[PDB]
Design a protein around this ligand. Structure first.
Ligand SMILES: N[C@@H](CCC(=O)O)C(=O)O
Ligand SMILES: N[C@@H](CCC(=O)O)C(=O)O
Lengths: 248, 248
C-alpha cells in the first residue's frame, strides 16, 4: 500500500462535505483525487492519502540547504507519490523525479478588473500596488532564481516586504487580492478556477513562463515510468480533459 | 561523442542554404539544431548528427512488434539521442525514454480557407473530401488507437484508403492539401509554421489532443535526467521561447 502525500488546494484536493463523519481517503475529493483513483486502478496499487505535515509544496532552505513540503517527504522516502498540483521545475528535478505532465500552465497575475495594470512590468515599476506569491512554492522560487531584469526587481520588492506579501497559501493570496491593493503571482490553471467564481477578478497579462504539473516520486522510483505511461494514456483517451471540465 | 538521430522537417531541422557545399553538422539548421547546440553547451558533450535512415519517426508493427524510424534507432542503440519534433506518446514510452517536453502541441487539421468544414466531426461524416496523416507517425497512431467514435470512424476511412491518403511526410501532406480536395491531420506547431507561408491554408477547429515533443533516449539512459534538467533551465530562462520566435 502506497503512501501518497498531497495538499489542500481547490479544486485539486479538498475535504468532501457531507452530513456524516468521513474517514481515511473518503475525506477527500478533487481533480487530483480523481487522478489518484485512475492511477491506482491502472497500476493496481492501494494507497493512503496523507496531507503534507507542514502544509508546503517544497523549497530548499537557503541557509541549511534542507528541503520542506511534499518534496522533502519524497526525498526522505516518507511518501511514495506526491499527487497534487506540483510544478515540474529544474531545481526539483535535481532532487526528485516527476512523471510526464498531466497539466500544462504558467505563472501569471491575479488582480482586480478595471485597472491600468496590464503586465508584470507595470507592477515592477511601481510600489503603490503590492504583490507576492506563495512562500516555498515554485512561483516564489522562479522569481528568487530569475536573472531577468524585471523579475529580479519584483523579487527584490517581494523579499523586502516578505512579511506582508508572501502568503502561506493560494487562498490567503486570493483573499489579499479581494481585501486590499494587492496583485498575486500564481499559476494560470488556478487563476482560471478563481476567476470563474470571483467575477470581479481577472488574470493580468499572459503567461510569465511555461511549466507542467507532474506526479512526484523519490528519485529513482520504479513507479515514475509506470505513472508516466498511465498519464499519457489518460491524456490520449480524453480523460484528463474530462477531469478538468468536471472540476473547473 | 554522441550519435544524434534526427529527421528533416521545417523549421525544426533543415539543410542550410549556401553557395558552396556544407559537410557534417554544418549542413543543418533549425529549431532542433539550436536546441541540440544549447544542450551541447550546457551538458558539455560532442555530437554527430545523422538523418534517420528510413526517414520515419517511428511506429510499431502490429504483427511482429518491431519498430522503425528514430524510435528503432534508439532501441537498437544505433543513436544516443533523438533530437527532432518527436512526440511523447504512451506506446513509445513503453520502449524508449523522453526528456520533459521542450514544446507542447496537439493534433489538428490543415485545410483551405472559406469552406463549411469546421471540425473533425465534419470530415468524419462525409467522404468527398479526403483526409489523412503521415504514415508511421504519432498522429496516425493516435487515430489507429482511438476509441473516441469520431476518430475511430476517421481511422476506418484512413486505413481503408491508406495507399491513397497516408503520406510519407508532412511536406507530402501539405502538397496534397494544395493540389486536391484533401485535409491533412497534423501537429499544431507545424500548422502554425505552414499557414504563415500559404495564405489560402488554415487550421480547422481546435486541438484534437494535447502532447509534447521530447528528446528521445534509449531506455535507461543517464542522459535523460541531465537533458530534462537542461531543457527546464532553458525553458525557465526564456531561451526556448526565443528559439521558437526565431524559427516561426
Ligand atoms: N503549484 C506550486 C505552488 C503554487 C505556486 O507556487 O504558485 C508548486 O508546485 O510549488
Ligand atoms: N512529430 C510526429 C510526426 C508527424 C505526425 O505524426 O503528425 C511524430 O513524432 O511521430
Amino acid at each position: 500500500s502506497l503512501i501518497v502525500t498531497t495538499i489542500l488546494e481547490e479544486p485539486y484536493v479538498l475535504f468532501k462535505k457531507s452530513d456524516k463523519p468521513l474517514y481515511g481517503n473518503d475525506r477527500f475529493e478533487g481533480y487530483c483525487i480523481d487522478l489518484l483513483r485512475e492511477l491506482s486502478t491502472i497500476l493496481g496499487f492501494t494507497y493512503e492519502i496523507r496531507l503534507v505535515e507542514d502544509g508546503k509544496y517544497g523549497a530548499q532552505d537557503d541557509v541549511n540547504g534542507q528541503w520542506n513540503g511534499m518534496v522533502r517527504e519524497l526525498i526522505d522516502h516518507k511518501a511514495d507519490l506526491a499527487v497534487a498540483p506540483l510544478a515540474i521545475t529544474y531545481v526539483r528535478e535535481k532532487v526528485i523525479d516527476f512523471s510526464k505532465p498531466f497539466m500544462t500552465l504558467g505563472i501569471s497575475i491575479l488582480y482586480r478588473k478595471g485597472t491600468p495594470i496590464d503586465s508584470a512590468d507595470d507592477l515592477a515599476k511601481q510600489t503603490k500596488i503590492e504583490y507576492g506569491a506563495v512562500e516555498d512554492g515554485a512561483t516564489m522560487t522562479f522569481f528568487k532564481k530569475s536573472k531577468i531584469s524585471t523579475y529580479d526587481k519584483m523579487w527584490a520588492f517581494m523579499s523586502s516586504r516578505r512579511q506582508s506579501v508572501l502568503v502561506k497559501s493560494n487562498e490567503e493570496g486570493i483573499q489579499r487580492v479581494l481585501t486590499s491593493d494587492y496583485a498575486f503571482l500564481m499559476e494560470s490553471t488556478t487563476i482560471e478556477f478563481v476567476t470563474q467564481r470571483n467575477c470581479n477578478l481577472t488574470q493580468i497579462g499572459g503567461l510569465i513562463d511555461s511549466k507542467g504539473y507532474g506526479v512526484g516520486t523519490p528519485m529513482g522510483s520504479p513507479y515514475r515510468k509506470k505513472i508516466t505511461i498511465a498519464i499519457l494514456q489518460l491524456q490520449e483517451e480524453g480523460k484528463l480533459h474530462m477531469m478538468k471540465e468536471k472540476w473547473w
